[PDB]
């Protein structure tokens, strides 16, 4: 929503004529307040992992929980990745969107892609985003690359030193870190003078 | 707006009025402060001293150094 | 820990306003004219 | 460097430390610039009241502004550069330029002394601090939409009409912004139970069988 | 405080510094109301608005060295924190020194 | 007029129930509490004991005062501003400035904190036009920011850390702290879930 | 000394973010604050490249400045004229001879030449292809901005100035380039064509030696220029 | 004079003298260097209080509060612009031409 | 009557019968398809017929038409007003505030007044002007 | 005191018998907060008018002469002399500088909005008994809707209703 603030009529409502339709889910307080009313480009949502995960309260009560890992983002450069427990799925969802929201970065499209490669690692996930002239990942690594805008660009995870390889949150987790440590173009030049 | 300080004094006059040249906003505060009649929300002008030294302190902030080289 | 940092924060903020699609508050442009008071060098 | 710069910041920084050597009748330089930031503040200050509903409605004036642009930028498509951001703030500071020029009409009319003026005065000042936007900006927005949408002898005869009334400079994504918004149903319910009676009742009865005749 | 077939001091400790406590205090829907509602500047500073540390953010984090790693510093002042240390209750106070006169 | 709307409330319902609750006190103590004068006063404290005739405290002045113009705007969120806020004050300039203020003797953090309460009633930082004066009351004569020598709460996370170190006894010496999980037994509810502070106590 | 080097230097394509990187190590790396000619020396630089965004750190410069208790003076507005001249921005121009004027600070003959330039920049931007979907001709738009610069030329010569040279290669450099519009926009009105020669020959042959100034490299380009366009290559 | 600098387009480049000289030459803009708007604000006040100027109570230049408000300037300039129209032919008639 | 003309249910035998007419002209000029249709000679013609009909009808005028053959500044500016002034063309426009020339049809006969969004039978857009006062 | 606030009382309108009529006072005279009368004008009326009158007793007359005049005579910076010393506030060699503050916040306590943010911050504090809420409760309710807009113009005037008792 990009009107937060304005002249609140009387005589008129808040909404417009010609207005997108909300989901179901979609509240206008899922943006954050130092993120409302700034985003130009309309985002689009993919999920990671939905999971089960026993949440302990008390020694004589234990629920079951949904955790949900996600990301959002839009192809003009701006995407951002999150995460949630909740009691349902729908709560996950929310609550995971607008962590991914709160947590959102952005890069240079001026050349689509890296320009030198990036070797970067957390703990025990190697990854690696290359210079290319094509889109070089598997598909969960392509949709990332996608939802970041990076149609020239190579992506290259290596798990085996994790502690649980087969953890979907590690995948998200190490290309968003290294899409973060990327240096633009300007930004090299502007540093070099 | 490319107004004439002539200009722009003609109309600072014309959208003012007469109250221009009369007494100044603190003054008409000092006037309702004195005779009684001033609202809460108001900021009571109660002393010119230290008022005197805020103001001090709030334009030595942006008070230019001498840069002028004998 | 240095990944919450006023420079990486002004740096964060100025690479998301150079996509386009951002728009930059009224802290960015008044913080690269006041930078933040570093540590270093001194 | 002891050069003429760095001893002038080295008094300066001095002069500032204590309480002592900048206050009245004590340094004529500080004392000639606080002469001056006083004269001119002797004129171009408001009564408070006055000054509170000015912040009001030059908070409203830069939302507007700042939607207006939001609104060209996300039907056009196009990107934030430096120049729609001089652009803005160069609307902006106008905007409030005039907003400054119109409200000391009203922070005159509130010194005035006069009854009718003063209430006058009061009137808006409550309507701009509880957030209540103007209609002169509603004749505003209708009057643009009017002079866009009528042909040249009208066109001529608003812009002949209008060109010495000082009028706001307002973007066409502003008129957009009004004309778009949908009107309030409970709004026009109370208004056509005011302004008519009983005959209203019904009319506005008819019209919710009609509402339930598209819901079917 | 209703007692309720406990003793007090502990009812108050189970009802202000347990787990489901913070936990209803943050928002999850707990059985019946494990928290104190209405506290003023008696309240932890724990378990304040305005502080920087939120349990609903931690329970999607299995494991303390994931909680160390992925979690925001906590907010240092507030207002409850600013009534503390208007106080002095930023600290207790010393009790009497048991370390030299007796064990009775 | 929402507090006095949460008031009028508060007194509506404790009349209907013929008794305090625990809920409609905590519903007006949320309200009357949801102001962020108390950042604001921090950052105007900190720019209290500054020089008005020094460049680099012109420079901390400038930063701490667009700081806090942009927390009553709400385009700043409050962790990253107390970043921001605890990485001003932890400088060794400012550390410098508070020094020579606290050495000269006629100190001008008075007319400081006097000139940040006209400020914030003129930008309107305030939720009531005349609310500043009696938190600079507030200030004054209790235990607060403005009666601390440095300008800020004494709080360790807005001290350095190298003199952190000699002072205090912490865990082991020579972020966020934990207890490990080695004590099975430290208290009646404590656990390594349960977060410990250096200087303070919030239980 | 190094950015007033920098300023001027044609050498590499790389001196104004050397000049960037130059003032922020100097500010943050060095420690030291920077003083009206650190300013002045700044904002001359990036009052040269028409980009937004060095246009908009000249004018967070120039902010920054009166923020810092540093008072504009004739250079700080005739920074300010620069940097709004080469985008042609003329109401920007405008505002700023009226800002100087409102602070008592007189404005001399090089805000004049500047604001010249600035109607040369503003009939160069003229979108013309709008103005071809219209139907509407550029000539009345030519006609003032060339009547308004005439008037500036008549008001400096009624206040007693001495006349400089930038000021009468700014008139040159705005008839040559009226006449190099109008031969690129409206070809087939050649009186049009005849009028601004005849002017720009006027002010070649005649207001040179009228107060006694001798041409320079920027006079002859101007010139060179508008010979080059007519294709008379013998005579350039 | 301010819809006439307006449209002037030579304004900007013109100093403070020079428009003095052309609106009125009279002692009223006269003043005795430096020329600012408080200076004339300034010099008029007391050029009021004295009586020597007088200003109508009430603005005269009405904008931005009621939707008619170009029509109620109008009806508050009618008297001055009727007698700057009017009050130099009487100047032509009275010298007995 | 004049009691009639105020607010508050006074006046239902001809509110009621505004309130009809406003409603029935937008329904007829939305759901009607009968009438979009183009012109002809049959409609050129009895159109004019009932354009000179119309301008054929004059209205009956009341008693006031007929006449037979140190002052104040207040009574002297209305005698120097009628001989002086003839023909006012400041006052008639005055009158289109009053009358609000063309009321009930320059609702429809702008140009791109009524949005889409309001273009159905139920939509209440006739009823934006309504102001109780 | 009742003696010093007398004698401050009989010279301020000795002196407007003496004026006659109006007396304006200005932006730039309230700044350097000089009344009609100077302290060696007053000091010599005490002098000549009343012969026994020592040294200290005088200099105490002038300063409570130079206050009445202005604004009635309110003793707040007595009392805020005992709960704020110098030293804490930073002002120990300005002995002028620190009771013109005194005196600037004395007066800025007697003030109907500083007894009302008084009032809603010990509100805060949990300062209130059953018998406080319900005087509370007879205070709103004699307020009507036309009495609430009346007071609501001013951001206290509805506030303190409530709150006078409290």
């Known amino acids: ?193 | 707006k490319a107004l004439s300080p002539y200009a722009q004094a003609l109309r600072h006059v014309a959208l003012r009025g007469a109250t221009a040249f009369g007494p100044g906003a603190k003054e008409m505060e000092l006037d309702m402060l004195r005779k009684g009649t001033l609202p809460a929300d108001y900021r009571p002008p109660v002393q010119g001293r230290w008022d005197d030294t805020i103001e001090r302190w709030a334009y030595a902030w942006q008070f230019p150094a001498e840069e002028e080289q004998d | 820990n240095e990944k919450y940092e006023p420079w990486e924060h002004m740096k964060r903020m100025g690479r998301l306003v150079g996509t386009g699609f951002y728009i930059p508050p009224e802290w960015y442009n008044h913080f690269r004219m006041f930078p933040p008071i570093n540590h270093n060098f001194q | 460097l002891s050069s003429g710069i760095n001893l002038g910041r080295l008094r300066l920084a001095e002069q500032f430390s204590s309480m002592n050597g900048w206050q009245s009748k004590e340094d004529p330089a500080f004392d000639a610039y606080v002469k001056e930031r006083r004269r001119k503040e002797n004129y171009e200050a408001f009564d408070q009241r006055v000054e509170r509903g000015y912040a009001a409605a030059a908070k409203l004036h830069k939302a507007e502004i700042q939607n207006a642009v939001k609104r060209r930028l996300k039907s056009s498509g196009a990107k934030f550069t430096a120049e729609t951001l001089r652009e803005m703030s160069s609307a902006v500071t106008e905007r409030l330029a005039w907003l400054r020029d119109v409200w000391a009409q009203i922070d005159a009319d509130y010194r005035s002394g006069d009854s009718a003026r003063q209430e006058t005065a009061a009137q808006e000042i409550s309507a701009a601090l509880r957030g209540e936007p103007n209609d002169y900006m509603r004749w505003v927005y209708e009057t643009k939409r009017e002079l866009r949408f009528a042909g040249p002898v009208g066109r001529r005869a608003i812009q002949e009409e209008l060109q010495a009334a000082e009028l706001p400079e307002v973007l066409d994504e502003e008129v957009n912004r009004y004309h778009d918004l949908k009107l309030n149903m409970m709004e026009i319910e109370r208004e056509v139970k005011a302004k008519y009676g009983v005959a209203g009742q019904q009319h506005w009865a008819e019209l919710q069988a009609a509402k339930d005749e598209e819901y079917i | 405080i209703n007692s309720g077939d406990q003793s007090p001091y502990r009812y108050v400790e189970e009802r202000l510094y347990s787990k489901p406590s913070r936990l209803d205090r943050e928002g999850v829907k707990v059985n019946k109301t494990y928290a104190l509602q209405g506290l003023g500047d008696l309240e932890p500073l724990r378990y304040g608005a305005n502080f920087g540390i939120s349990e609903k953010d931690a329970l999607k984090y299995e494991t303390v060295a994931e909680k160390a790693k992925y979690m925001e510093p906590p907010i240092p002042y507030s207002s409850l924190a600013a009534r503390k240390l208007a106080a002095g209750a930023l600290w207790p106070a010393a009790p009497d020194p048991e370390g030299m006169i007796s064990k009775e | 007029d929402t507090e006095f709307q949460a008031l009028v409330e508060f007194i509506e319902g404790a009349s209907y129930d013929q008794l305090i609750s625990g809920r409609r006190f905590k519903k007006v103590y949320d309200v009357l509490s949801e102001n962020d004068d108390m950042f604001i006063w921090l950052c105007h404290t900190a720019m209290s004991v500054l020089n008005p005739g020094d460049m680099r405290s012109r420079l901390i002045y400038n930063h701490l005062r667009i700081l806090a113009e942009s927390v009553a705007s709400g385009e700043m969120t409050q962790r990253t501003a107390f970043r921001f806020f605890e990485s001003a004050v932890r400088s060794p300039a400012y550390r410098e400035i508070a020094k020579r203020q606290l050495e000269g003797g006629a100190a001008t953090r008075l007319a400081g904190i006097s000139a940040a309460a006209d400020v914030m009633r003129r930008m309107g930082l305030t939720r009531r036009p005349m609310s500043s004066y009696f938190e600079l009351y507030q200030r004054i004569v209790e235990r607060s920011e403005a009666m601390t020598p440095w300008g800020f709460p004494p709080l360790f996370q807005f001290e350095e850390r190298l003199s952190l170190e000699p002072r205090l006894k912490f865990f082991s010496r020579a972020r966020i702290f934990w207890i490990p999980p080695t004590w099975n037994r430290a208290g009646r509810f404590l656990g390594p879930h349960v977060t410990l502070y250096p200087g303070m106590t919030p239980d | 000394l190094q950015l007033k080097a920098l300023a001027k230097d044609n050498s590499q394509l790389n001196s104004l973010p050397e000049a960037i990187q130059l003032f922020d190590q100097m500010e943050n790396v060095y420690g030291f604050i920077a003083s009206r000619p650190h300013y002045d020396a700044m904002m001359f630089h990036l009052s040269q490249s028409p980009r937004p965004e060095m246009r908009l750190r000249c004018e967070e410069l120039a902010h920054k400045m009166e923020l810092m208790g540093i008072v504009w003076n004739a250079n700080t507005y005739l920074n300010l004229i620069r940097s709004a001249q080469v985008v042609g921005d003329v109401a920007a121009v405008e505002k700023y001879l009226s800002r100087m004027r409102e602070e008592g600070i007189p404005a001399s003959i090089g805000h004049l030449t500047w604001a010249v330039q600035a109607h040369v920049q503003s009939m160069i931007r003229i979108d013309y292809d709008a103005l071809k979907e219209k139907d509407e001709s550029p000539l009345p738009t030519w006609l003032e901005h060339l009547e308004t610069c005439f008037g500036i030329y008549e008001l400096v010569v009624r206040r007693g100035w001495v006349m400089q040279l930038p000021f009468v290669n700014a008139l040159l450099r705005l008839t040559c380039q009226a006449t190099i519009l109008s031969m690129e926009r409206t070809p087939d009105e050649a009186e049009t064509i005849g009028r601004f020669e005849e002017q720009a020959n006027k002010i070649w042959n005649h207001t040179f030696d009228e107060w006694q100034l001798q041409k320079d490299v920027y006079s002859y380009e101007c010139y060179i220029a508008l010979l080059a366009h007519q294709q008379r290559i013998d005579e350039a | 004079v301010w819809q006439g600098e307006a449209n002037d387009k030579l304004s900007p480049y013109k100093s403070d003298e020079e428009i003095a000289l052309e609106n009125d030459n009279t002692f009223f803009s006269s003043l005795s260097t430096r020329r600012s708007k408080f200076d004339y604000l300034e010099k008029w006040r007391d050029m009021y209080r004295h009586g020597t100027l007088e200003v109508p109570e009430g603005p005269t230049l009405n904008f931005g509060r009621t939707p008619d408000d170009h029509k109620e300037t109008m009806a508050a300039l009618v008297r001055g612009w009727y007698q700057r129209n009017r009050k130099e032919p009487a100047s032509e008639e009275e010298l007995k031409r | 009557c004049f009691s009639s003309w105020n607010d508050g249910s006074e006046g239902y035998e001809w509110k009621s019968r505004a309130l009809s007419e406003k409603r029935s002209l937008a329904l007829e000029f939305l759901g009607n398809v009968n009438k979009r249709v183009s012109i002809h000679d049959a409609i050129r013609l009895k159109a004019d017929i009932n354009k000179k009909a119309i301008s054929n009808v004059s209205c009956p005028s009341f008693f006031s038409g007929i006449e037979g053959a140190h002052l104040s500044p207040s009574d002297a500016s209305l005698l120097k007003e009628e001989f002086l002034c003839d023909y006012d063309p400041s006052d008639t426009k005055r009158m289109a505030k009053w009358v609000n020339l063309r009321s009930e049809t320059s609702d429809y006969q702008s140009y791109g007044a009524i949005p889409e969004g309001e273009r159905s039978l139920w939509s209440a857009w006739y009823l934006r002007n309504i102001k109780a006062g | 005191e009742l003696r010093l606030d007398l004698t401050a009382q009989s010279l301020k309108e000795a002196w407007m018998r003496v004026s006659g009529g109006v007396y304006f006072q200005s932006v730039d005279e309230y700044y350097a907060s000089v009344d009609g009368l100077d302290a060696e004008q007053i000091g010599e009326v005490l002098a000549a008018l009343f012969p026994e009158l020592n040294c200290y007793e005088a200099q105490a007359l002038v300063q409570r002469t130079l206050e009445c005049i202005s604004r009635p005579v309110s003793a707040a910076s007595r009392q805020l002399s005992r709960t704020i010393t110098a030293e804490a506030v930073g002002l120990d060699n300005a002995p002028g500088h620190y009771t013109n503050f005194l005196e600037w916040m004395g007066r800025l306590t007697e003030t109907r909005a500083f007894k009302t943010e008084h009032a809603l911050f010990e509100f805060s504090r949990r300062k209130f008994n059953r018998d406080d809420v319900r005087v509370m409760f007879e205070n709103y309710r004699l307020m009507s809707k036309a009495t609430l807009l009346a007071d609501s113009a001013d951001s206290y005037s509805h506030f303190y209703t409530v709150l006078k008792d409290f």
């Open chain 1, 1 to 193: 929503d990009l009107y937060p603030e304005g002249f609140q009529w009387k005589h008129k409502l808040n909404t417009e004529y010609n207005q997108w339709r909300s989901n179901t889910w979609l509240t206008p307080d899922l943006i954050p307040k130092e993120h409302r009313g700034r985003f130009l480009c309309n985002f689009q949502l993919n999920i990671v992992a939905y999971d089960m995960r026993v949440v302990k309260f008390s020694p004589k009560d234990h629920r079951q929980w949904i955790y949900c890992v996600l990301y959002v983002g839009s192809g003009k450069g701006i995407a951002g990745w999150g995460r949630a427990v909740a009691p349902s799925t729908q709560e996950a969802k929310k609550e995971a969107i607008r962590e991914a929201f709160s947590n959102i970065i952005a890069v240079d499209l001026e050349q689509e892609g890296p320009m030198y490669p990036v070797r970067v690692n957390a703990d025990g996930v190697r990854v690696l985003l290359y210079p290319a002239r094509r889109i070089v990942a598997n598909f969960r690594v392509a949709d990332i690359l996608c939802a970041f805008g990076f149609q020239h660009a190579g992506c290259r995870i290596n798990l085996k030193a994790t502690n649980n390889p087969k953890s979907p949150t590690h995948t998200v987790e190490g290309v968003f870190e290294a899409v973060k440590a990327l240096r633009s173009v300007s930004e090299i030049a502007a540093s070099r003078g």
